Design a protein around this ligand. Structure first.
Ligand code: HEM
Length: 152
């Protein structure tokens, strides 16, 4: 898994997100939707967002960004002992939302991008390495549950 030092870096980076969780969450989703428009189609309630300006102006998009990053933050704070938090999310995303594991890769990449965009020069090589490992662990544990379910 991750070392104690690596987890410390992850949670330090997470403090930066927590200062503006809605702002980070909004930017993560906009990065996801604009880079991969197929992802928007998974959200009946964001389908109407035909432009990035409309996305930016959407308070509901921001609200969902908050929900998403709040859940992720909870999982990260468990430092890999996250089965109870992660299993239900994996199951909802496979069975109800029908989100392929590829889209979780896309959103992981979007998180890394947004961290660099909002914290340029303040999200160093060590920090990126640690956050990347944590998001890979998250994705991998979801993928294990997806396999159980035969999803995708
Ligand atoms: C960091 C990764 C993600 C986290 C932590 C996360 C978390 C959540 C949470 C907590 C909910 C509400 C509870 C639930 O339905 O399980 C939710 C809903 C949902 N998620 Fe995710 N999610 C992630 C990635 C994604 C991705 C990549 C997609 C699609 C590309 C997606 C699609 C959806 C949809 C369609 C809903 C229902 C939205 C609604 O209509 O209210 N999620 N997510």
């Amino acid at each position: 898994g991750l070392s104690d030092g690596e987890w410390q870096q992850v949670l330090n980076v997470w403090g930066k997100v927590e200062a503006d969780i809605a702002g980070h969450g909004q930017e993560v989703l906009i990065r996801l939707f604009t880079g991969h428009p197929e992802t928007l189609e998974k959200f009946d309630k964001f389908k109407h967002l035909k432009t990035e300006a409309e996305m930016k102006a959407s308070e509901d998009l921001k609200k969902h960004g908050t929900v998403v990053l709040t859940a992720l933050g909870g999982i990260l704070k468990k430092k890999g002992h996250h089965e109870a938090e992660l299993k239900p999310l994996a199951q909802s995303h496979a069975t109800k939302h029908k989100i392929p594991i590829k889209y979780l890769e896309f959103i992981s990449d979007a998180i890394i991008h947004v961290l660099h965009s909002k914290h340029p020069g303040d999200f160093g090589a060590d920090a990126q390495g640690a956050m990347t490992k944590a998001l890979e662990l998250f994705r991998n544990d979801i993928a294990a549950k997806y396999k159980e379910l035969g999803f995708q």
